[PDB]
Design a protein around this ligand. Structure first.
Ligand SMILES: [Mg+2]
Ligand SMILES: [Mg+2]
Ligand SMILES: [Mg+2]
Ligand SMILES: [Mg+2]
Ligand SMILES: [Mg+2]
Ligand SMILES: [Mg+2]
Ligand SMILES: [Mg+2]
Ligand SMILES: [Mg+2]
Ligand SMILES: [Mg+2]
Ligand SMILES: [Mg+2]
Ligand SMILES: [Mg+2]
Ligand SMILES: [Mg+2]
Ligand SMILES: [Mg+2]
Ligand SMILES: [Mg+2]
Ligand SMILES: [Mg+2]
Ligand SMILES: [Mg+2]
Ligand SMILES: [Mg+2]
Ligand SMILES: [Mg+2]
Ligand SMILES: [Mg+2]
Ligand SMILES: [Mg+2]
Ligand SMILES: [Mg+2]
Ligand SMILES: [Mg+2]
Ligand SMILES: [Mg+2]
Ligand SMILES: [Mg+2]
Ligand SMILES: [Mg+2]
Ligand SMILES: [Mg+2]
Ligand SMILES: [Mg+2]
Ligand SMILES: [Mg+2]
Ligand SMILES: [Mg+2]
Ligand SMILES: [Mg+2]
Ligand SMILES: [Mg+2]
Ligand SMILES: [Mg+2]
Ligand SMILES: [Mg+2]
Ligand SMILES: [Mg+2]
Ligand SMILES: [Mg+2]
Ligand SMILES: [Mg+2]
Ligand SMILES: [Mg+2]
Ligand SMILES: [Mg+2]
Ligand SMILES: [Mg+2]
Ligand SMILES: [Mg+2]
Ligand SMILES: [Mg+2]
Ligand SMILES: [Mg+2]
Ligand SMILES: [Mg+2]
Ligand SMILES: [Mg+2]
Ligand SMILES: [Mg+2]
Ligand SMILES: [Mg+2]
Ligand SMILES: [Mg+2]
Ligand SMILES: [Mg+2]
Ligand SMILES: [Mg+2]
Ligand SMILES: [Mg+2]
Ligand SMILES: [Mg+2]
Ligand SMILES: [Mg+2]
Ligand SMILES: [Mg+2]
Ligand SMILES: [Mg+2]
Ligand SMILES: [Mg+2]
Ligand SMILES: [Mg+2]
Ligand SMILES: [Mg+2]
Ligand SMILES: [Mg+2]
Ligand SMILES: [Mg+2]
Ligand SMILES: [Mg+2]
Ligand SMILES: [Mg+2]
Ligand SMILES: [Mg+2]
Ligand SMILES: [Mg+2]
Ligand SMILES: [Mg+2]
Ligand SMILES: [Mg+2]
Ligand SMILES: [Mg+2]
Ligand SMILES: [Mg+2]
Ligand SMILES: [Mg+2]
Ligand SMILES: [Mg+2]
Ligand SMILES: [Mg+2]
Ligand SMILES: [Mg+2]
Ligand SMILES: [Mg+2]
Ligand SMILES: [Mg+2]
Ligand SMILES: [Mg+2]
Ligand SMILES: [Mg+2]
Ligand SMILES: [Mg+2]
Ligand SMILES: [Mg+2]
Ligand SMILES: [Mg+2]
Ligand SMILES: [Mg+2]
Ligand SMILES: [Mg+2]
Ligand SMILES: [Mg+2]
Ligand SMILES: [Mg+2]
Ligand SMILES: [Mg+2]
Ligand SMILES: [Mg+2]
Ligand SMILES: [Mg+2]
Ligand SMILES: [Mg+2]
Ligand SMILES: [Mg+2]
Ligand SMILES: [Mg+2]
Ligand SMILES: [Mg+2]
Ligand SMILES: [Mg+2]
Length: 102
RNA sequence: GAGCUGUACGUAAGCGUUGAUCCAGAGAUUUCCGAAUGGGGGAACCCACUAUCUUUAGUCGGAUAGUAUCCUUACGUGAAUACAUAGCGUGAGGAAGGCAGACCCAGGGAACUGAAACAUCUAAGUACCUGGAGGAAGAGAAAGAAAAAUCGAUUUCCUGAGUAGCGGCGAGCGAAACGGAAAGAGCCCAAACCAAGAAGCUUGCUUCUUGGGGUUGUAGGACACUCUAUACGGAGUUACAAAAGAAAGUUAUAAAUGAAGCGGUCUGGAAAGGCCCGCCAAAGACGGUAACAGCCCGGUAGUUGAAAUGGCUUUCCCUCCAGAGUGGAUCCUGAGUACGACGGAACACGUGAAAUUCCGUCGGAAUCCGGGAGGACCAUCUCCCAAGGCUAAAUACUCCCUAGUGACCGAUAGUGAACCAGUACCGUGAGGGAAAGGUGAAAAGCACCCCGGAAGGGGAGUGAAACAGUUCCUGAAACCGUGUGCCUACAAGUAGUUAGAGCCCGUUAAUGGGUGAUAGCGUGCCUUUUGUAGAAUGAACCGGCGAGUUACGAUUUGUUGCAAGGUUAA
RNA sequence: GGGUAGCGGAGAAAUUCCAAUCGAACUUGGAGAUAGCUGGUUCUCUCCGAAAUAGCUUUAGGGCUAGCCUCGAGGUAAAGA
RNA sequence: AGGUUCGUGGUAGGAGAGCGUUCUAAGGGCGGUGAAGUCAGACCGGAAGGACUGGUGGAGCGCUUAGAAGUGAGAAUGCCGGUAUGAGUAGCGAAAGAAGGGUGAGAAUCCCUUCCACCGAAUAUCUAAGGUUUCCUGAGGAAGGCUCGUCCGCUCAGGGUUAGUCGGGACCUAAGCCGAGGCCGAUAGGCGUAGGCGAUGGACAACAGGUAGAGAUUCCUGUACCAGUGCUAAUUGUUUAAC
RNA sequence: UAGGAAGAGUAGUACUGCCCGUACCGCAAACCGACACAGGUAGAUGAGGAGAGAAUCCUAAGGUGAGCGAGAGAACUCUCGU
RNA sequence: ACUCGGUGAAAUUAUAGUACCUGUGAAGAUGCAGGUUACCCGCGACAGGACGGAAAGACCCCGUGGAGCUUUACUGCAACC
């Protein structure tokens, strides 16, 4: 996908529009991403070996990758991304600031 | 280029930037059955022999290779029977089986039906069975079509034309040439003769093989002489002879890059929608994203990319090559053949005045001073040269792969099959053959409390919605219930309609709505009938599905264009 | 455990049996056989409106021509009642 | 456009004008401030039909002018699905049960005890065929069981079948079947010799006990037999030739 | 007997002996009959009294009480007795 | 069979508030006419009617329907001479 695990994310649409977060996991097969502090759900969980006490656990849920834009590490605004092969590696390039995100 | 160990959750254990999972090309491995092939067999099983090796103290056990049948061929052995043949053995090559329910060539070959009966005829050389194929097959370079003049190998399409004809002259069947197009390409033998060899001895001869020569109708060739030519030139694996090897280019099979809004605000669970502003465009295809996106994502136009393998096209290499003329002694030019009789079949043509082609059986020519055809046949003329073979393209079809399209279907439709479908199920078997799609944007799939053994509920919670709670979008009718306003236990009812009190309501507001004591009138619907309430037929009820269409011809009416003209087909 | 298969087989003979099927088995195909016969054929209104007869017919509950209906167009030395 | 006159029952049937459904094209629109569909109303048109308002629903659909049709159902002993009536009706598939304890949420129906009854050339015990896990143990009670069920040939999870001698093959053949060469025949194939398959028959070596969840001539304990092999110890034979 | 043949038997010891079936039902609720169906299904064994007997009646070993019940005791129908 | 507890079908069915007599009518009426009877809802019984249910009458006729059989019907074919 265009967004990797460990990246910084600005949420572009949805109920959490305007918020920012970090990628905790990526699901390219189904095209979803898990982002910290974003799209919290409440699960009614019975007591089990995992989660010994159970209850109403408040955790995170995936959102679609199209509702996401990368944050420039310096300019700090959502940018579309380009790809430039610099040296022996192809790196991602911010298309507003014209600089290398990686 | 960052996650991964499928559907498929989960647990467990692990692996990946020292670059995994994944995608494409090329390799290796590939149990048993099945043509099944060492022998057998009731499918996926059973039992071996011969060589070489291995284990054990030795039987017992293990590994590898070979071992079917027929055809062709080489060698060897070898009977009645003397030579020899048959037979037997070994080796080397080849075949066998399947299918794409299509297309085409051949062998065999119906009936129902139509003729308003039926036998000739039709259906129909169709269905079907069997055998051969090929990517196409078949046909194909005139013993042709023709007719005051010519054409010049096949095939397919348009016309000719529902014409000429055939026909219990009934029902019906039904051409071809000329003319216009698509596509186009021509060639090898046999025989006269030459050279060599071999067998018989046909005993100095014929007859067998090999090589050269040569293939045609104005007749051509052999044969005689002239001219040139042995690679100067020409041709080629699609016929014309056949097998290889290189290089360049292109294409197919993975991919890379790729412009422009997080614009403000309203509603909302969520904006891609409304209103107000911008921008890109060789890119406003398509799909996704919480509602309808050129500017969010995958992408799109444009421009690039191939280690490996395949295809195609050029060039090289390689390979193979006599062709003109003038003569007319002698020689050659496809024999049990062409034809004829008899019996059949194919020709549009049913025996007919029946040409032309093929099959079975009998008879049976000429050979250049020769032979065939021109729809009986003769004469004249004209055209042609059989009884040997090969040949691309234009034509037919689609099990497949790639890219797309539709005034095609939308879950009783469209394939039988949108779902683990030729499945479940039925049948001894061949065979027949279903039903069955939809939670939500996201499992956030209801912690906890209460009644109950559970199932199932009532709260609480999630969500925009739970009257979306794991047959879950919507949720009609039949059918089953609970509650209630008006009527009903002296009445004879196709159940309504017209008149009409009383009681109860209050509308799309108008000479309004529900129910109805009592009074008049009144024998369902359909089909089929001279005539049906009919004791004639059909329907338990509700829902879905369910019957004059299309192609090509004819005729008539309307409309439009042109008009003694109108109009093109392929 | 085996053999005989439908233009066939078996029959101490009854048209008897050949997988609950037999004056000619079952299955698939020709095949949507053919049916001058019975049943069915789906929205509305406006104008007109029959026949159940003659002739021939392997004809008689079928057909064909005429007679009777409907739509359109014509011509008069007006022909109809 | 307006008059005048004459008309306006209708089956088979002829002629005309229209309504509604799906799709296409152009124009012009509606719609999360709620589309289609569905429900209910006392509205409009000459008919087929068409609006308006409210509930449910939760994403698409009208209008105009043309065009094209899988074009409109009440009947076919029509096809498929759903649901009634008969009706709490017929039936519940040959037979002897009773009580006391137990288990359990729950007992005529499950377990135990006692008494009674039935079969007994069988309704007892083996074993071929056929079936194919139905067998044992632990859990279970939605559906199946013509009632009930705590039970089960039912559901779930784990188990369970031991052979030199038993039955079959590695042994034999009958009927019948296949069949190298061969004979016959439009094709396909039919018949048949050598050879080979094929038991329902012939030949062939093991008995008695024990085994408390499920196997027994198979496992175990005692005592055997059949066929072979090596190793020891004696005997004997060698090409007028042991065997 | 034709043939093959220098090894052979004897006694004792110890070792070797493959593949397939094997559960369970089997006059039956497990097989053939669409069913937990009054039908059908080869063979071996099959006790006592009385008896010719495998007839008949009552019993042994062994196996069963049959997958809807209780209570009333009308017509009528069925199977029985006088 | 009947009453009680458990379980629980089917053929059939245009909608039904479903009397009798004499008549009428497609000529034999629960439903039409004129009269005569008759409070509402069931349970156990019996079969006169609903031309009761079941099976598109096997008899009879018709169709230019079919099939099996016969012969000195017609036309053929095998086989044999
Ligand atoms: Mg392997
Ligand atoms: Mg085989
Ligand atoms: Mg074999
Ligand atoms: Mg085996
Ligand atoms: Mg060995
Ligand atoms: Mg030889
Ligand atoms: Mg000799
Ligand atoms: Mg082949
Ligand atoms: Mg082929
Ligand atoms: Mg014929
Ligand atoms: Mg013909
Ligand atoms: Mg013909
Ligand atoms: Mg074939
Ligand atoms: Mg090929
Ligand atoms: Mg071609
Ligand atoms: Mg060819
Ligand atoms: Mg030519
Ligand atoms: Mg020629
Ligand atoms: Mg020429
Ligand atoms: Mg063409
Ligand atoms: Mg030559
Ligand atoms: Mg010459
Ligand atoms: Mg914004
Ligand atoms: Mg909001
Ligand atoms: Mg917007
Ligand atoms: Mg585009
Ligand atoms: Mg789009
Ligand atoms: Mg944008
Ligand atoms: Mg000659
Ligand atoms: Mg002639
Ligand atoms: Mg002739
Ligand atoms: Mg001619
Ligand atoms: Mg000629
Ligand atoms: Mg050829
Ligand atoms: Mg639906
Ligand atoms: Mg869903
Ligand atoms: Mg969804
Ligand atoms: Mg409780
Ligand atoms: Mg609960
Ligand atoms: Mg709802
Ligand atoms: Mg809903
Ligand atoms: Mg409802
Ligand atoms: Mg309803
Ligand atoms: Mg009431
Ligand atoms: Mg009175
Ligand atoms: Mg009133
Ligand atoms: Mg009153
Ligand atoms: Mg009649
Ligand atoms: Mg109905
Ligand atoms: Mg027959
Ligand atoms: Mg008899
Ligand atoms: Mg009979
Ligand atoms: Mg009209
Ligand atoms: Mg409508
Ligand atoms: Mg529009
Ligand atoms: Mg509606
Ligand atoms: Mg409605
Ligand atoms: Mg309504
Ligand atoms: Mg709603
Ligand atoms: Mg049209
Ligand atoms: Mg249509
Ligand atoms: Mg339709
Ligand atoms: Mg109707
Ligand atoms: Mg029908
Ligand atoms: Mg029906
Ligand atoms: Mg249904
Ligand atoms: Mg039905
Ligand atoms: Mg019912
Ligand atoms: Mg008791
Ligand atoms: Mg089972
Ligand atoms: Mg049950
Ligand atoms: Mg019951
Ligand atoms: Mg219990
Ligand atoms: Mg069990
Ligand atoms: Mg044995
Ligand atoms: Mg053997
Ligand atoms: Mg023995
Ligand atoms: Mg020994
Ligand atoms: Mg073995
Ligand atoms: Mg074994
Ligand atoms: Mg037993
Ligand atoms: Mg006696
Ligand atoms: Mg007795
Ligand atoms: Mg006893
Ligand atoms: Mg009761
Ligand atoms: Mg009862
Ligand atoms: Mg009366
Ligand atoms: Mg009553
Ligand atoms: Mg007639
Ligand atoms: Mg008959």
């Amino acid at each position: 996908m265009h967004v990797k695990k460990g990246d910084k994310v600005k949420v572009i649409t949805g109920k959490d529009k305007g918020k920012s977060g970090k990628v905790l996991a990526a699901f390219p097969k189904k095209d979803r991403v898990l982002i910290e502090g974003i799209n919290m759900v409440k699960k009614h969980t019975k007591p089990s070996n995992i989660n010994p006490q159970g209850g109403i656990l408040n955790v995170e849920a995936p959102i679609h990758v199209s509702n996401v834009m990368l944050i420039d590490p310096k300019t700090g605004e959502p940018t579309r991304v380009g790809y430039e092969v610099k040296g022996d590696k192809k790196v991602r390039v911010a298309k507003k600031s014209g600089e290398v995100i990686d």
